[PDB]
Amino acid sequence: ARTKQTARK
Amino acid sequence: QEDQAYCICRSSDCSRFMIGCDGCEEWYHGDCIGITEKEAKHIKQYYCRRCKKENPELQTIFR
Ligand SMILES: [Zn+2]
Ligand SMILES: [Zn+2]
Ligand SMILES: [Zn+2]
Numbered sequence: 001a002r003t004k005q006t007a008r009k
Numbered sequence: 010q011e012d013q014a015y016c017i018c019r020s021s022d023c024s025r026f027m028i029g030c031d032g033c034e035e036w037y038h039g040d041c042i043g044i045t046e047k048e049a050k051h052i053k054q055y056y057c058r059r060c061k062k063e064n065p066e067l068q069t070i071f072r
Contacts, residue, residue: 001052006026
């Protein structure tokens with residue numbers, strides 16, 4: 001999906 | 010189920026985790042709509058609550 005600003009930790 | 014339009018982000022500079030609805034092209038705050046980053050990795054197309062109201066055929070599509 002289109003996502004933005006994930007912490008991606 | 011309450012209406013979730015208050016989960017929409019219309020802020021240009023917002024740094025919160027957010028996911029785009031493929032049904033209305035609005036951005037939704039992930040915490041507000043109850044989708045973790047880990048689940049979102051497996052989402053092909055998100056359809057927001059209001060879109061799934063408008064078309065009860067619709068369901069978020071996973072991958
Ligand atoms: Zn926001
Ligand atoms: Zn939508
Ligand atoms: Zn998957």
